[PDB]
Write an enzyme that holds these catalytic residues in place. Sequence first.
Site, PDB file in Angstrom:
ATOM      1  CG  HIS A 248     -16.237  31.768  -7.000  1.00 28.61           C
ATOM      2  ND1 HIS A 248     -17.598  31.555  -6.925  1.00 28.61           N
ATOM      3  CD2 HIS A 248     -16.009  32.363  -8.191  1.00 28.61           C
ATOM      4  CE1 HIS A 248     -18.168  31.995  -8.032  1.00 28.61           C
ATOM      5  NE2 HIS A 248     -17.222  32.484  -8.817  1.00 28.61           N
TER       6      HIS A 248
ATOM      7  N   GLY B  65     -25.640  32.438 -10.676  1.00 24.17           N
ATOM      8  CA  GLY B  65     -25.670  31.020 -11.033  1.00 24.17           C
ATOM      9  C   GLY B  65     -25.110  30.721 -12.409  1.00 24.17           C
TER      10      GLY B  65
ATOM     11  CB  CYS C 287     -19.860  31.052 -11.950  1.00 21.78           C
ATOM     12  SG  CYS C 287     -19.785  32.707 -11.207  1.00 21.78           S
TER      13      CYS C 287
END
EC number: 3.4.19.12
Lengths: 306, 306, 5, 5
Positions: free
Chosen positions: A41, A143, A145
């Site tokens: 993503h 932030g 991930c």
Amino acid sequence: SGFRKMAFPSGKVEGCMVQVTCGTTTLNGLWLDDTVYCPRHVICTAEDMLNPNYEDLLIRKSNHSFLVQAGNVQLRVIGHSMQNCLLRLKVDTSNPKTPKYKFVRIQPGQTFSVLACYNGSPSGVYQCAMRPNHTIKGSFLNGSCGSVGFNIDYDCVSFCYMHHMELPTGVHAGTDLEGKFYGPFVDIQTAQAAGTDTTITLNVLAWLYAAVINGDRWFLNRFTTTLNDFNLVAMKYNYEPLTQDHVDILGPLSAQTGIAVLDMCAALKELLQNGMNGRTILGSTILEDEFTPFDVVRQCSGVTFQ
Amino acid sequence: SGFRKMAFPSGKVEGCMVQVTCGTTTLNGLWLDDTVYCPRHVICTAEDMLNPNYEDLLIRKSNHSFLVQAGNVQLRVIGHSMQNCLLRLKVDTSNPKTPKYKFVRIQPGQTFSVLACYNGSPSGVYQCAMRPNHTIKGSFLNGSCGSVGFNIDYDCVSFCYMHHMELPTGVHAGTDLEGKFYGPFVDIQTAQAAGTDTTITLNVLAWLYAAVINGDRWFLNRFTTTLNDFNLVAMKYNYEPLTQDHVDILGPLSAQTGIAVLDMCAALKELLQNGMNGRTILGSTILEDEFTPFDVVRQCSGVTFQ
Amino acid sequence: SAVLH
Amino acid sequence: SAVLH
């Protein structure tokens, strides 16, 4: 003496975090050899997340749609492919800090350390158990991930987790390092929820053994129990059933303490029924299920106190 | 979301651990630039520990009485001096992994991360608070001396603790990085005991603010309290008194949540009197005093949930 | 006693 | 909803 939740030294994983930017989205990626792994993503936009087609969104990108940086060094992308829920970005330099490593799918109940990161930069580290419902109680912000979870054995780093999202209850879901989610979860901005969880019995017991190896015995008793009578009680209390395989696993800890597993279970069954009567075990007022038996052996001593 | 005890990435401290051997004793030392720091009882023997004179024992050693190794590299000692309870060994190579650093004396209530090490080799990491009685609840085994505690700010490493021993209660005592013990303790094998401890009020409050920043408000109330009426209650419960300076410190957390400090104290005073009635805060059944207000700001968000 | 690790 | 960090 002492007993703490203890993470693995993160020096080796730290030399592998980078920042990966696609469009207006930035997150963390893992740079091993000449590949940077990250959640797919990174190619999403807030609007897309609601109902994204990854296949479609990715054919629409090139190598130079991806910015990869380590420290201040811009790394150039020279290949890309989607693996499950992850992206594999081939870059033009091999990480020279690459350690010995491998990828493992962690099982429910097992533990790992998580190196929390922002903008490819490591903020902090802690140890979390994979729950029975395949969530972990981490601490993550926007932030985070691409932050990863791992164990280290010898000189090898066993990567088992990349962070991909947060559930409504505030717990975290993620994939192994092949991109396959832990649990029934998908990387979409859609209504999704943790299933009911249960207490990891094998661990509570491993931890009671630690208390004894730490020479505290107050919560023992004269009783024993059948596996099967243990379980009627386990069920009532939302503890996992114990199995003969879990009994075999606890034998070394049984051998070092001289307390029979079924004897220990009777200890537990009593704890469950009578509470702790305002007392502590290993300085906790609660029964602790986030230490595996492997965690106890590593941390405890080879010799019991008394 | 989430809230965990979280250690600092240990990659920078790891590149500084070495093994230091004198006689039959081995422990860990810290190699910054061309100096290796370690506890001075590396020059002791089990018999000596009971009533040692360090001055006397050290004049009896030479540079080559000390073996220093990093990885498999033998480092050569070319100078030595005793500083307080520590030894400064000058070696023939400067650590090239030396980071930006400094030495700080930590104050009671402040936190740091501890990189537990054996034989100059880092086993694990966790975060512990300096208690009011100058002990820490670590987890250490024989051979863990010279293990260190630190914070990291920006790119700098603030070394505040070297481990030197364990008290009868199973808690740990140690020095700052000038060799001056934290607390009334000495590096001798003699009867020594932790003083009574107390609960760090400033932290319990910082943590209740975290609960709110995490959007949980169940434990608040309509009341307020005077500082002075708070304290009669703090004392009854073995909480540190609150002071006006601690009130000033909590203001930013007060400002982000809109809860007045004295209002929060009334919350606490109620918690103290009525228990938690089987509920949890930040997933704990207990009031948690091991997170500073600086720990909350670093970990929490800039924006409150609601 | 204290124990020096 | 889930939230992708």
